[PDB]
Amino acid sequence: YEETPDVIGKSVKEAEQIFNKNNLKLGKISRSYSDKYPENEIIKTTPNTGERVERGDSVDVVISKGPEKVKMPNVIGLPKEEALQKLKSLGLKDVTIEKVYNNQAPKGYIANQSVTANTEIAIHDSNIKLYESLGIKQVYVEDFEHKSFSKAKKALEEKGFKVESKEEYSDDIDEGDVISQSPKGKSVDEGSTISFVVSKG
Ligand SMILES: [Zn+2]
Ligand SMILES: [Zn+2]
Ligand SMILES: [Zn+2]
Ligand SMILES: [Zn+2]
Ligand SMILES: [Zn+2]
Ligand SMILES: [Zn+2]
Ligand SMILES: [Zn+2]
């Protein structure tokens, strides 16, 4: 009894006018993600273009809600391969893993994600950068057994650690050098605490 006029790619507003102008009244506006059509253009009608409709009949449309979009999972504290799969199943597959140091997250675990958790994010051009954990950094402890503890504080601090010390008398180590040192220099560890015995005089 009549073509469904064509409204694919038009606003709802222009669509009613083409419908009304044809005796049809639109009615029933649903929405979708489209690859192909920009947000707000129409994608599909449901008698369907040029398919038969009766006059006074209504025709439903489905409008584009822009492109395919999703709520970012949280993956902080998951192990790397699990984290990657949470997002594979979700459509997030453009993922760059960047290894870094960390005082919370297990070696191998995700410390931190690019795009913030539970935001909605578009499977189009999501450059997902994930920060994997390496451990805490090992720094080196230069030995100071003999030598101005006064300087040595300054080394050690500037650089990782905090430094703790107490005083003994020695007539075998100049008032102020170092009688002993705690983490036996020349290993490497965290931002830990180096303890000193300093000749008191
Ligand atoms: Zn067309
Ligand atoms: Zn009908
Ligand atoms: Zn000594
Ligand atoms: Zn000296
Ligand atoms: Zn002692
Ligand atoms: Zn003395
Ligand atoms: Zn302490």
Q: Report how far ligand 7's centroid is from the alpha carbon of 193 (Å).
A: 7
DSSP structural state of residue 117? T
Biggest CA–CA distance in the chain, Å, is 115
Those residues whose C-beta lies under 8 Å from the C-beta of residue 57, and which sit 6 or more positions away, are 24, 47
DSSP structural state of residue 47? S
Q: What span, in angstroms and rounded, lies between the C-alpha atoms of 59 and 46?
A: 6
Which ligand approaches the C-alpha of residue 151 most closely? 4
Which ligand approaches the C-alpha of residue 165 most closely? 7
Whether the CB-CB separation of 88 and 120 falls below 8 Å is answered with no
Whether the CB-CB separation of 80 and 114 falls below 8 Å is answered with no
Beta bridge partners of 26: 59
Approach to solving: X-ray
CB-side neighbour CA atoms (13 Å) of 130: 31
Whether the CB-CB separation of 50 and 1 falls below 8 Å is answered with no
Resolution (A): 2.9
Q: What span, in angstroms and rounded, lies between the C-alpha atoms of 141 and 157?
A: 11
Which ligand approaches the C-alpha of residue 200 most closely? 6
Whether the CB-CB separation of 176 and 149 falls below 8 Å is answered with yes
Please state whether beta strands 162-168 and 193-199 pair in parallel, antiparallel, or not at all (unpaired). parallel
The tokens for 164 are 């703790």
Instruction: Give φ, ψ of 4 to 5 degrees.
Output: -75, 120
Which ligand approaches the C-alpha of residue 179 most closely? 3
Beta bridge partners of 164: 195
Rg (CA), the chain: 34
Which ligand approaches the C-alpha of residue 144 most closely? 3
Q: What span, in angstroms and rounded, lies between the C-alpha atoms of 159 and 182?
A: 17
Please state whether beta strands 193-199 and 188-189 pair in parallel, antiparallel, or not at all (unpaired). unpaired
Whether the CB-CB separation of 87 and 123 falls below 8 Å is answered with no
- List the shell of residues around ion ligand 2, using CB closer than 5 Å: 54, 57
Domains of the chain (ranges plus CATH)?
A: 1-66 (3.30.10.20), 67-134 (3.30.10.20), 135-201 (3.30.10.20)
Kindly provide the residue ranges of all beta strands, DSSP E only, lying in 8-79, ordered along the sequence: 25-32, 42-45, 58-64, 69-71
Q: Which residue has the tokens 């010390």?
A: 165
Exposure letters 12-33 (e unless 16+ CB within 10 A, then b):
beebbeebeebebebeeeeeeb
Q: What span, in angstroms and rounded, lies between the C-alpha atoms of 98 and 130?
A: 6
Beta bridge partners of 63: 31, 42
Q: Report how far ligand 1's centroid is from the alpha carbon of 122 (Å).
A: 27
Q: Report how far ligand 4's centroid is from the alpha carbon of 140 (Å).
A: 23
Q: What span, in angstroms and rounded, lies between the C-alpha atoms of 72 and 117?
A: 5
The tokens for 112 are 């931190």
Beta bridge partners of 30: 62
Tell the burial category of 153 from Cβ atoms under 10 Å away from its Cβ (0-12, 13-18, 19+).
middle
